[PDB]
mmCIF file of C-alpha atoms in Angstrom:
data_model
loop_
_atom_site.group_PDB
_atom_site.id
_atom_site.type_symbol
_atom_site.label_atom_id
_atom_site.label_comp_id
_atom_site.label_asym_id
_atom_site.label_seq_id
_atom_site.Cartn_x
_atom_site.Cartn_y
_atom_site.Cartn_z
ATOM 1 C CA UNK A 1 0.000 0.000 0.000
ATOM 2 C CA UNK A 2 0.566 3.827 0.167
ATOM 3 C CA UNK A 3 2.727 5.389 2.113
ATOM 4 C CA UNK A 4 4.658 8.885 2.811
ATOM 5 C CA UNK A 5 7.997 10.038 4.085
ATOM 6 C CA UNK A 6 10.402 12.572 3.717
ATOM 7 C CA UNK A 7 13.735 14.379 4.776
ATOM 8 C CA UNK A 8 15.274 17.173 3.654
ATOM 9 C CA UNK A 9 18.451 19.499 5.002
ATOM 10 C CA UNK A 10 17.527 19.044 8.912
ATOM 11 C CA UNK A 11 21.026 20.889 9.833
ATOM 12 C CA UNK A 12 19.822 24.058 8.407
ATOM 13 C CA UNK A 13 16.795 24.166 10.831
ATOM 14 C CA UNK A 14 19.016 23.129 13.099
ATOM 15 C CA UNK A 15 20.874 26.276 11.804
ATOM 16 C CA UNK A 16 17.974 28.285 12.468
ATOM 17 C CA UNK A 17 17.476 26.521 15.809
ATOM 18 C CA UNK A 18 20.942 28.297 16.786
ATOM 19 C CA UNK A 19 19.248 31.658 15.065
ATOM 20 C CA UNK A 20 16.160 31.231 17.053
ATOM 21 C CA UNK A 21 18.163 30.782 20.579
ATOM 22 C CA UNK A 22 19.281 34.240 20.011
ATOM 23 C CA UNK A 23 15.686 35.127 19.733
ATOM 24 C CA UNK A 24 14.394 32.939 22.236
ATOM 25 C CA UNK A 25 17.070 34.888 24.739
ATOM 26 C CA UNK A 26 16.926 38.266 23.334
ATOM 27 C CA UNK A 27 13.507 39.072 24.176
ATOM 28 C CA UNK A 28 13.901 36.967 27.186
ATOM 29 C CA UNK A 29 16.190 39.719 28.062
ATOM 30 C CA UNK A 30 14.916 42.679 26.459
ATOM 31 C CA UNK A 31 11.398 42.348 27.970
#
């Protein structure tokens, strides 16, 4: 039968998980 599945690039999310922390602690800080 049918199925689905995927993956694709998961370090550059994990990139942007580094460029969120900044913005998951700036704020934190600059509220």
């Amino acid at each position: 039968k049918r199925d689905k599945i995927k993956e694709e690039e998961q370090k550059k999310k994990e990139w942007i998980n580094q460029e969120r922390q900044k913005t998951l602690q700036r704020l934190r800080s600059f509220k």
